[PDB]
Amino acid sequence: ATVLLEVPFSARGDRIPDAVAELRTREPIRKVRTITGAEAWLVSSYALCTQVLEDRRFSMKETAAAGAPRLNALTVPPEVVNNMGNIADAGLRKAVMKAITPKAPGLEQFLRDTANSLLDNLITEGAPADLRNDFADPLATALHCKVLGIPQEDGPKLFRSLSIAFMSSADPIPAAKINWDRDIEYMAGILENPNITTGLMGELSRLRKDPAYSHVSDELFATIGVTFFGAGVISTGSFLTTALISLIQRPQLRNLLHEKPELIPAGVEELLRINLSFADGLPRLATADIQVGDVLVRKGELVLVLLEGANFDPEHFPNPGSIELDRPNPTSHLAFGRGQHFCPGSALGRRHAQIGIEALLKKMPGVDLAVPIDQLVWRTRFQRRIPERLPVLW
Ligand code: HEM
Numbered sequence: 399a400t401v402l403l404e405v406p407f408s409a410r411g412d413r414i415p416d417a418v419a420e421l422r423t424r425e426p427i428r429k430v431r432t433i434t435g436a437e438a439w440l441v442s443s444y445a446l447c448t449q450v451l452e453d454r455r456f457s458m459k460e461t462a463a464a465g466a467p468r469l470n471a472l473t474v475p476p477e478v479v480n481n482m483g484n485i486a487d488a489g490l491r492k493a494v495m496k497a498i499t500p501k502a503p504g505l506e507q508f509l510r511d512t513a514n515s516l517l518d519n520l521i522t523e524g525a526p527a528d529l530r531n532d533f534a535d536p537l538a539t540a541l542h543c544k545v546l547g548i549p550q551e552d553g554p555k556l557f558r559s560l561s562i563a564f565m566s567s568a569d570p571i572p573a574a575k576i577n578w579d580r581d582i583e584y585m586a587g588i589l590e591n592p593n594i595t596t597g598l599m600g601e602l603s604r605l606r607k608d609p610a611y612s613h614v615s616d617e618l619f620a621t622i623g624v625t626f627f628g629a630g631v632i633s634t635g636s637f638l639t640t641a642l643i644s645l646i647q648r649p650q651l652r653n654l655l656h657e658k659p660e661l662i663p664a665g666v667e668e669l670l671r672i673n674l675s676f677a678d679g680l681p682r683l684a685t686a687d688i689q690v691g692d693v694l695v696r697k698g699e700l701v702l703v704l705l706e707g708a709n710f711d712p713e714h715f716p717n718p719g720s721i722e723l724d725r726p727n728p729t730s731h732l733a734f735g736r737g738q739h740f741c742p743g744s745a746l747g748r749r750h751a752q753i754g755i756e757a758l759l760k761k762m763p764g765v766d767l768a769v770p771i772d773q774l775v776w777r778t779r780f781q782r783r784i785p786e787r788l789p790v791l792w
């Protein structure tokens with residue numbers, strides 16, 4: 399006898415497991431067991447991933463209900479799982495979305511200058527350099543302090559919550575509450591701090607005193623700062639780190655982008671498509687009985703949308719493991735989700751990666767791994783796949 403197939407399959411973010419293509423061909427929706435012991439439906443084709451993400455009866459907010467089958471334990475309060483819904487209900491969606499575009503005057507120049515400074519520091523110090531801890535993550539942290547309007551020197555302490563806040567655990571995590579309550583207290587103080595007049599927190603601070611928002615809670619305003627910092631920094635830092643591995647493993651591409659930097663946006667879009675940064679499928683709870691493929695999903699069941707299942711589906715993306723800059727459907731991947739919950743940071747995340755890559759390739763055109771790739775240490779039981787260190791030379 400064997401036990402029911404367990405998820406996730408592997409924490410390694412440098413290769414896709416052969417099980418994904420076997421599932422997708424043979425059983426593109428099938429039952430699995432999560433780390434909590436709950437059963438769930440794992441969906442792994444482009445067609446069925448899109449179906450689930452476009453039908454709101456597969457609900458994100460209902461995954462927080464008491465007694466539901468769970469992918470992992472909550473690391474935030476349960477109402478926060480409906481964060482963007484709560485922001486829309488408070489009349490804040492347009493303003494939040496506006497503050498996190500990469501379009502603010504000076505923002506791109508600030509990203510380039512920050513990237514170049516970080517890279518000059520590594521060159522001065524000499525190889526090997528850790529491109530996660532000393533490049534991608536500080537670049538994401540600096541970006542988010544600037545986008546929020548908060549001091550750059552507060553970024554490192556906020557960032558050190560993230561190795562716990564984004565855990566994917568079978569059980570509640572006591573440190574996640576300690577850090578959440580401290581970070582909410584910090585963001586509440588930011589809303590009271592007259593120096594904070596720019597970025598997302600400067601805008602929320604003004605709207606908070608405007609009569610049209612007088613009954614929006616201070617808790618929601620503070621929660622927007624904590625959740626957008628955390629989700630944006632973990633998502634951009636982890637994506638850029640694993641994208642740099644994919645790039646370094648393709649010297650030909652590396653060299654093409656270095657020669658013809660105008661191709662960096664197309665290269666980043668393919669790097670998004672093939673990215674393994676999400677460690678788990680996106681969870682949803684069925685609110686009705688719904689046919690998905692050969693399975694009737696029942697009300698109350700958990701469904702997990704496997705992004706690499708969609709993004710490596712050869713019926714949508716022929717030769718899915720190859721980066722091809724001339725695809726006719728280049729942005730149709732699911733790296734930013736799809737439907738109601740499509741990522742509102744998508745433009746920002748694209749620009750962080752494009753600028754980080756352009757700066758790296760101009761400063762370190764000969765970048766290469768400084769250790770055999772199998773020697774990277776992949777973080778486990780986490781919502782992202784990331785190497786603990788990314789040692790390079792040039
Ligand atoms: C390369 C970087 C990023 C990737 C790959 C990414 C990916 C995603 C994905 C897959 C979702 C959908 C989740 C779901 O449907 O269950 C999402 C939603 C979200 N993302 Fe991102 N993200 C990135 C950057 C950012 C940034 C920069 C921010 C904010 C500063 C951000 C904030 C959010 C929020 C608030 C949601 C929830 C939206 C909703 O529920 O309507 N993300 N992101």
Ligand SMILES: Nc1cccc(Cn2cncn2)c1
Pocket residue numbers: 472473474475570571572573574575578579
């Ligand atoms: N209030 C709060 C904030 C963040 C996370 C949680 C869930 N949890 C409860 N104990 C450990 N984690 C509860």
Ligand SMILES: Nc1cccc(Cn2cncn2)c1
Pocket residue numbers: 481482625626629630633741743
């Ligand atoms: N960037 C990202 C990816 C997956 C899930 C989320 C959810 N979120 C909503 N508010 C903060 N985080 C955000």
